[PDB]
From a paper:
To investigate how these ligands adjust TCR interactions to tune affinity, we solved the structure of four APLs (A2-ILA3G8R, [name]; A2-ILA3G, ILGKFLHWL; A2-ILA8T,ILAKFLHTL; and A2-ILA8E, ILAKFLHEL), included our previously published APL structure (A2-ILA8R, ILAKFLHRL), and used the ILA1-A2-ILA complex as a model. Both of these ligands included substitution of peptide residue 3 from Ala to Gly, a substitution that was clearly indicated in our previously published unbiased combinatorial peptide library screening using the ILA1 T-cell clone. Structural modeling of the ILA1 TCR with these ligands indicated that interaction with the N-terminal portion of the peptide was likely to be very similar for both ligands. However, for A2-ILA3G8R, a major reorientation of TCR β-chain residue Gln-96 would be required to tolerate Arg at position 8 in the peptide. For both of these ligands, the extra flexibility, afforded at the N terminus of the peptide by the substitution of Gly compared with Ala, may enable the ILA1 TCR to establish enhanced contacts with peptide residue Lys-4. In fact, substitution at position 3 with Gly could override the negative impact of modifications to peptide residue 8, revealed by the enhanced binding affinity of the ILA1-A2-ILA3G8R interaction (KD = 1.0 μm) compared with the index peptide (KD = 34 μm) and ILA8R (KD = 151 μm).
Recognition of peptide-major histocompatibility complexes (pMHCs)5 by the clonally expressed αβ T-cell receptor (TCR) mediates T-cell immunity. Combined with biophysical analysis, we demonstrate the molecular mechanism for antigen discrimination by the ILA1 TCR and model the mode of cross-reactivity with these APLs.
Numbering used by the authors:
A (entry chain A): 1 to 276
B (entry chain B): 0 to 99
C (entry chain C): 1 to 9
């Protein structure tokens, strides 16, 4: 299957309360493998998966230097954007950055990303071509022009198509048992009488990896989204995920309805039906 | 400024069996800004020994966190998750339902 | 691994 490496950064200003909170996390696919937190004790980049613990002190020292430099960057960014938007010193603001790379089944480069939000909305992003920028407004045009003169896109393109992909392959080899697995969902159905006239059917998918899954209800063979409820896919806390989808149906007509489950670990999609 | 109210799910790691050790989870997702208060409650009293995941975010820049604690459910004990966020006019308390 | 990135907005 295809794979990704993504780094996520969040800097939050603290008016009257000192230095910003900064939190950085790194993922391969849906598995977290590193963090840095300004609130934590070590002030180092730290392991969060077993397979990365065997990297030596040169790796940790390097990652620590860089992540601290990313922290200082976003500390300055908070002040810069406050100035661009002429915002008061009174309020807390947020800068977020994500970057990383996708590779196909051949483990060859497919796509790269490097993008920012300010207070929860897009600010600037590197376009899919890795040569040009999308600026959300007139403030972000200032940053776009700056980054064009400093050839930021060229630098990012080199990392994204090179270093990013190289290390993602290294991590997939060395985290093999964890990262290259597929755990198919364990499925079942539950039922609640709502009244004499209605019932709820709930179709469950449990203990699956990776997180990507599709749960759909049909009635007589037809996709049915009226009177359905689909919860966000959620972590179990052991490395797997969970999801459910429910439908409210008229009493006695439960046999019309089918739950369909699609997942990488299932060689054929599953159909579930409820019987009394 | 974007503000988004949290989605809150309270559930167990494994199917619940009275008298068998397990993890109680409170997953809060889809929120903005990042400042959030999350407590797990046992019969209305906060549980101290609760762990949480490292702040992360989705494609739409909204945040998510998992808070979790080791527990052994019984028929008698009631569990809940209490959430406070700037988008809430008062804290939200979501009771554990064993089929959700 | 992280990028060796120093660019500011």
């Amino acid at each position: 299957g295809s794979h990704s490496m993504r780094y996520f950064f969040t800097s939050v200003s603290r008016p009257g309360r000192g230095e910003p909170r900064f939190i950085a996390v790194g993922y391969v696919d849906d598995t977290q493998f590193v963090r840095f937190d300004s609130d934590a004790a070590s002030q180092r980049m730290e392991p969060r998966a077993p397979w990365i613990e065997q990297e030596g002190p040169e790796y940790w020292d390097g990652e620590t230097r860089k992540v601290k430099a990313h922290s200082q960057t976003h500390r300055v960014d908070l002040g810069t954007l406050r100035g661009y938007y002429n915002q008061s010193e009174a309020g807390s603001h947020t800068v977020q950055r994500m970057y990383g790379c996708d590779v196909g089944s051949d483990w060859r480069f497919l796509r790269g990303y490097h993008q920012y939000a300010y207070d929860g909305k897009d600010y600037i992003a590197l376009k899919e071509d890795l040569r040009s920028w999308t600026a959300a407004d007139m403030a972000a045009q200032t940053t776009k022009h700056k980054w064009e003169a400093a050839h930021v896109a060229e630098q990012l393109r080199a990392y994204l198509e090179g270093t990013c992909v190289e290390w993602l392959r290294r991590y997939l080899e060395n985290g093999k048992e964890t990262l290259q697995r597929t755990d198919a969902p364990k499925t079942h159905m539950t039922h609640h009488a709502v009244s004499d006239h209605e019932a709820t059917l709930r179709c469950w998918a449990l203990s699956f990896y990776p997180a990507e899954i599709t749960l759909t209800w049909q009635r007589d063979g037809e996709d049915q989204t009226q009177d359905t409820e689909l919860v966000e896919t959620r972590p179990a806390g052991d490395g797997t995920f969970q999801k459910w989808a429910a439908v409210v149906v008229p009493s006695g007509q439960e046999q019309r309805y089918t739950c369909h489950v699609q997942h990488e670990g299932l060689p054929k999609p599953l159909t579930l039906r409820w019987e009394p | 400024m974007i503000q988004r109210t949290p989605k809150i799910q309270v559930y167990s790691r494994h199917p619940a069996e009275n008298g068998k050790s397990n993890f109680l989870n409170c997953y809060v997702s889809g929120f903005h800004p990042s400042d959030i208060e999350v407590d797990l409650l046992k019969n209305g009293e906060r549980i101290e020994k609760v762990e949480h995941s490292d702040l992360s975010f989705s494609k739409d820049w909204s945040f998510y966190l998992l808070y979790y604690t080791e527990f052994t459910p019984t028929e008698k004990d009631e569990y809940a998750c209490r959430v406070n966020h700037v988008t809430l006019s008062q804290p939200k308390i979501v009771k554990w339902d064993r089929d959700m | 691994i992280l990028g060796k990135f120093l660019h500011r907005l």
